[PDB]
Amino acid sequence: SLVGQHILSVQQFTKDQMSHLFNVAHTLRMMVQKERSLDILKGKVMASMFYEVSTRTSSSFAAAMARLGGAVLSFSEATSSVQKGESLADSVQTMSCYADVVVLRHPQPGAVELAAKHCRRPVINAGDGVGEHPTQALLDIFTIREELGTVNGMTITMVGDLKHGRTVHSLACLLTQYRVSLRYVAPPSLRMPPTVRAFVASRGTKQEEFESIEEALPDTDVLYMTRIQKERFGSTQEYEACFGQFILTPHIMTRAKKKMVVMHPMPRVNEISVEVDSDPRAAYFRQAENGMYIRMALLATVLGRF
Template sequence: IKTVEQYSDVIVIRHSMEGAARLAAEVAEIPVINAGDGSNQHPTQTLLDLYTIKRAFGRIDGLTIGLLGDLKYGRTVHSLAEALAFYDVELYLISPELLRMPRHIVEELRERGVKVHETTDLEGTIPELDVLYVTRIQRERFPDEQEYLKVKGSYQVNCAVLKKAKASLRIMHPLPRVDEIHPEVDRTEHALYFRQVFSGVPVRMALLGLTLGVL
């Protein structure tokens, strides 16, 4: 890090080790942006996710949002859940029992007044949702291959499942996907994930501009 900062005005770091960005920030004398640290956090993804929701609905307050899939190891949903605590939202945490959201995040959300529901039932929950944020089951995060095999393919969002959803439901995904969203969903009005990808361009431009003092 001390070497890299000699070439840079800002360091953007993605690392497999949890806490890597914090460690880098402790030794660097230039700004450090966390672009994902292991299964911990992914704050820049959360900024673009919030921007995407705001652009799609004109608001974030008052929405009912479901987080689906790997909530234990998924850094994108960790960051997003904590950010949504700043808004008046209702959260459904939908996952296999083995992949539930870490307890400290759930407790923090409830302490901050967020109405949180934990469930394994996607089809029973989807009629309630304005936003469904889907994550893949991340094989590379599992310390035990057998644990991964127990939950592989737990959910798939397809057009049959979406028959129970509101017409206004929007589906998000940090990508890449495996099989948790069927490609047939891409052609529906529900799919928001490709616009979500594009949101990363202006949001990260703005973040770099603010960090470097040019905005």
């Protein structure tokens, strides 16, 4: 039961917990459609703390807490007393004095788990540098299930920057709970990390690397595209060399399975042609909307109403 627990890492997620949570997510989405009265989190305040920029992850948590009848406390680093020199631990300790939950994204990996040590209320990891994005894995798995019917028996193809990409890290790890085959399409420099490729191996999930998107596609049921993480590179030179390696265009999606989904945790810069947007296999915006409902489910369960 997720009640009152730190949500730090995909590891802790039982298959039973995820399915409880997919179910509550489908319930909460029904009531929003039915224009039902949601006073579920009336009284409860969420502390949204972002030290690293966000659009979907911050907006999805905020919209969710609103739509459960809760309130949100906005916290950015730039206008906070961080600027007086406050430590990350003290910032988190203080925001819990006001809030029932803490959503923390931060640029340094393990910072969230480090701050969550002395935190006396549930802290949700919304991204820890290149480490992990746990609720994003959860919504991607929900979306796969939603778009195709099952997750078991599926071939997931992760393309792009796997080294920095905290979403694929979490997502690869978590897809070890489903009978899947993973394929990686990266340049040598941005290959999926060792601990991750080692973790996935030890669960038995068959990993495979490919050089291009042309090769992986015809067997790919789930095509997960990523963004060349420009702000994690040691030098632009390294970045601009890698920028634009893979570019999904409608020409490429003419040898993709009829049954098939293209995802992206967003934002995209170059890596998906806008023309792809019309193909109904493109579910990356539907992926966004799912996120709000899963995060509604997590906030309801972690605060212990569903």
